[PDB]
Design a protein around this nucleic acid. Structure first.
Ligand SMILES: [Mg+2]
Ligand SMILES: [Mg+2]
Ligand SMILES: [Mg+2]
Ligand SMILES: [Mg+2]
Ligand SMILES: [Mg+2]
Ligand SMILES: [Mg+2]
Ligand SMILES: [Mg+2]
Ligand SMILES: [Mg+2]
Ligand SMILES: [Mg+2]
Ligand SMILES: [Mg+2]
Ligand SMILES: [Mg+2]
Ligand SMILES: [Mg+2]
Ligand SMILES: [Mg+2]
Ligand SMILES: [Mg+2]
Ligand SMILES: [Mg+2]
Ligand SMILES: [Mg+2]
Ligand SMILES: [Mg+2]
Ligand SMILES: [Mg+2]
Ligand SMILES: [Mg+2]
Ligand SMILES: [Mg+2]
Ligand SMILES: [Mg+2]
Ligand SMILES: [Mg+2]
Ligand SMILES: [Mg+2]
Ligand SMILES: [Mg+2]
Ligand SMILES: [Mg+2]
Ligand SMILES: [Mg+2]
Lengths: 67, 144, 60, 185
RNA sequence: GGACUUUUACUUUGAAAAAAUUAGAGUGUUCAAAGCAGGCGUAUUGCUCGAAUAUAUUAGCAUGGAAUAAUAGAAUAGGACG
RNA sequence: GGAUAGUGGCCUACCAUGGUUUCAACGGGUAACGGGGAAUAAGGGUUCGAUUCCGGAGAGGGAGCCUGAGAAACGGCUACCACAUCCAAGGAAGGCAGCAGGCGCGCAAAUUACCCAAUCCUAAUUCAGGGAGGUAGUGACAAUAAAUAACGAUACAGGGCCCAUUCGGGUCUUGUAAUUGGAAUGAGUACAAUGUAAAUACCUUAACGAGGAACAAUUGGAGGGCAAGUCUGGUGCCAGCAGCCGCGGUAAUUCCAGCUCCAAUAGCGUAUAUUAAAGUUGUUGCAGUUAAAAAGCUCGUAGUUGAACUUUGGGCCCGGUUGGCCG
């Protein structure tokens, strides 16, 4: 079997120059899993239809629930 | 020297003159006049898929004696009407009027094939199946 | 020439030829092995030289 | 947008399709060297076809031409290095002659057979594809490997399989499991 | 630097020149189509060859050739030299 | 002069009558984007290039324009034309020749999936974004390697060969065998680790996994060209075959089957196109008395073509690159 390998001049040296998937493979880093990549895209697009904070927009629709 | 100008500067005459006589070539003419696209039932396409109008027994040419069992087809991209032979004993019972057949050429470069007069094509599929499969057993004609 | 002659007999002969099922037979080897079977049959042991050679002979 | 992954094919096909002489001649090559195809003959005569071509082309240039020297000697040394071209005939009017069997005689299909080890070129096939018979410790399962004449000393069975020891294999190790059960405990 | 020079065709060599394709060298991708790799030890602390070459014309440019084939020159001398 | 970033009939004013063309202008066609290139292998050619690189053009059709270094931009706006969605009828919105996916068209073409790990690109920027791109799926477009078996034993039959007065079988195996014999292997299945961004496959490899009921090769053909039956049964100028020549009207070497056989073989057939065969487009290289083809005749412009002759011969020098005989 022919591979390739690295050895780092410290442990904290490896953790900063190494890919963040490699440390995951090993157990030296967690995999913080997020929304599906096309799920985030849609969340950005929904975030584009608002101008400003968006909690200020909630109150004007709480007036809609009367009229 | 009989004809063709041999001089070193006669190229123009030489290509002009050859450009002329290429029109006596049947294929060069056909390809440049676009006879494929202009005339002919297929568009120049490999095959074409029409719809069966009637069923014809065709009386074979001499010195044969037979009834050749073809189908009148109206090409779907055209409306051009075309008569087409149904090969392989039976297979006329495989078609029906208004059935949807896919026709190919006869491999004569236009040019009707056998004792069959006028027929430049042949059926390949009916109802999207292929007569071959139906003729042997490998497939069944679809429902409707 | 007549274009409307009878269709009644379409499929005639094939319908009325007496059925014969296939007969179960030795399996033939595939690929290289079949070529060997052809080599030894054609050349190695030969068979018959009668007048020259035959391939699909009947009664002779 | 990529680089085209390139290719080319390895065989040419005979002009006249039915020739009793050529079909007789061809089958006899498959019979001798253990081929499954007429394509395996087609493939080789196509290789030969271009080698003769390159040699035909060089032979027309002047002797001691820079190109004729560089590419002529290189073609030669490669045909020696595999063992098709004889060491005496090394000057390439033989590469212009040659013939198909000289290439066929160099196949790992045949060289596994040539010194013992096979006995019937067909048995040579079955062994090759079945991961017996290495060259180095490297197993090679292609019958067409073309023994390179200095790897010829090294064709033995593999560090694996029977015949090279370090296991019988499952058919035998199934029968060893019916002796210590029926006749044993 | 000053002062002037009949026009060409052909042919030679060369420059300017994309890569992939093609032709083709080297390399054993297990073979091969390919790829541009790879090959060596002290395999515990590196050593090392590569990643060529060819075509690339018609036109333009640069150089050599003076056969072949054109072209111009002096006859009311308004000639050539100084 | 105006306009341009700037040259220019770019535009305007004034002035002139010019510019192109049988060496084919202008016009028409193009089922025309151009190029690197592709197919065909004596050479010369013929044919093709929408399409992985370069250039150009476009974003339903036209025109216009804001922003900006850069756009006459369309995943920017404005208008008109054509489409077309929502509605409370007041109005409002849209531009897949991006990635998928649907309709339609047809002979004709795949997933509404995963990822920024690589390749590179952009930003204020090592971080974020990237349907660029990579990953997998669909996938006989094409291209590569090449399993469907291999080895003994035996029962006779040989063919050898020593001997033959004559049984004959005996050792050297030729192989056709209706009982046999133990071997081998991945096709699959699958611990595991490898692989990968995470998966999937491949390469590795535990446990498994071949005897005819498989784990069972096809596709065409068998009168000629053209490789392989004059077998048997069917039909009886019908049904069908047949690229071409031709087969079928009762013993069909061409049909419909069975048997057997041939060629190519994980592929093989048909249709269409094109190339070679084609020296049937002929520069290389055709033909024209009678087979297709010399204009009834001469003149003649363009075009092609066009006799011979002008430093030839002699002498010396210089230094190269092969090859000989010696080294
Ligand atoms: Mg005419
Ligand atoms: Mg006739
Ligand atoms: Mg009618
Ligand atoms: Mg239409
Ligand atoms: Mg002016
Ligand atoms: Mg167009
Ligand atoms: Mg084109
Ligand atoms: Mg193009
Ligand atoms: Mg073109
Ligand atoms: Mg188009
Ligand atoms: Mg559209
Ligand atoms: Mg318009
Ligand atoms: Mg626009
Ligand atoms: Mg868009
Ligand atoms: Mg855009
Ligand atoms: Mg309202
Ligand atoms: Mg397709
Ligand atoms: Mg089995
Ligand atoms: Mg068959
Ligand atoms: Mg024959
Ligand atoms: Mg009979
Ligand atoms: Mg038959
Ligand atoms: Mg010539
Ligand atoms: Mg002729
Ligand atoms: Mg005549
Ligand atoms: Mg002259």
């Amino acid at each position: 079997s022919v591979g390739f390998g690295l050895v780092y001049n410290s442990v904290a040296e490896a953790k900063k120059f190494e890919p963040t998937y490699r440390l995951v493979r090993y157990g030296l880093a967690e995999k913080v899993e997020k929304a599906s990549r096309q799920q985030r895209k849609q969340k950005k697009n929904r975030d584009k239809k608002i101008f400003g904070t968006g909690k200020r927009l909630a109150k004007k629709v709480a007036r809609r629930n009367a009229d | 020297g009989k004809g063709k100008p041999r001089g070193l500067n006669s190229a123009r005459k030489l290509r002009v003159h050859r450009r002329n006589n290429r029109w006596a070539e049947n294929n060069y003419k056909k390809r440049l006049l676009g006879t494929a696209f202009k005339s002919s039932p297929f568009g120049g396409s490999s095959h074409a898929k029409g719809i069966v109008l009637e069923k014809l027994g065709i009386e074979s040419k001499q010195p044969n004696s037979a009834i050749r069992k073809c189908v009148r087809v109206q090409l779907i991209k055209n409306g051009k009407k075309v008569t087409a032979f149904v090969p392989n004993d039976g297979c006329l019972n495989f078609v029906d009027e208004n059935d949807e057949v896919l026709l190919a050429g006869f491999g004569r470069k236009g040019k009707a094939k056998g004792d069959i007069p006028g027929v430049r094509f042949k059926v390949v599929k009916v109802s999207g199946v292929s007569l071959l499969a139906l003729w042997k057993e490998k497939k069944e004609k679809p429902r409707s | 020439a007549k274009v409307h002659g009878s269709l009644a007999r379409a499929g005639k002969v094939k319908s009325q030829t007496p059925k014969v099922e296939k007969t179960e037979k030795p399996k033939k080897p595939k690929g290289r092995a079949y070529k060997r079977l052809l080599y030894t049959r054609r050349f190695v042991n030969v068979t018959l030289v009668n007048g020259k050679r035959r391939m699909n002979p009947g009664p002779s | 947008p990529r680089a085209p992954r390139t290719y080319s094919k390895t065989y040419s096909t005979p002009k006249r399709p039915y020739e009793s002489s050529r079909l007789d001649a061809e089958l006899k090559l498959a019979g001798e060297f253990g081929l499954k195809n007429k394509k395996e003959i087609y493939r080789i005569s196509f290789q030969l076809s271009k080698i003769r071509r390159a040699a035909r082309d060089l032979l027309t240039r002047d002797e001691k031409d820079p190109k004729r020297l560089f590419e002529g000697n290189a073609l030669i040394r490669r045909l020696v290095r595999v063992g098709v071209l004889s060491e005496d005939k090394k000057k390439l009017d033989y590469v212009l002659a040659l013939k198909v069997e000289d290439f066929l005689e160099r196949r790992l299909q045949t060289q596994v057979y040539k010194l013992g080890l096979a006995k019937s070129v067909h048995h040579a096939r079955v062994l090759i594809t079945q991961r017996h018979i290495a060259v180095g410790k490297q197993i090679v399962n292609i019958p067409s490997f073309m023994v390179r004449l200095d790897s010829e000393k090294h064709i033995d069975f593999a560090p694996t399989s029977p015949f090279g020891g370090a296991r019988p294999g499952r058919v035998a190790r199934r029968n060893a499991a019916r002796k210590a059960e029926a006749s044993g405990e």
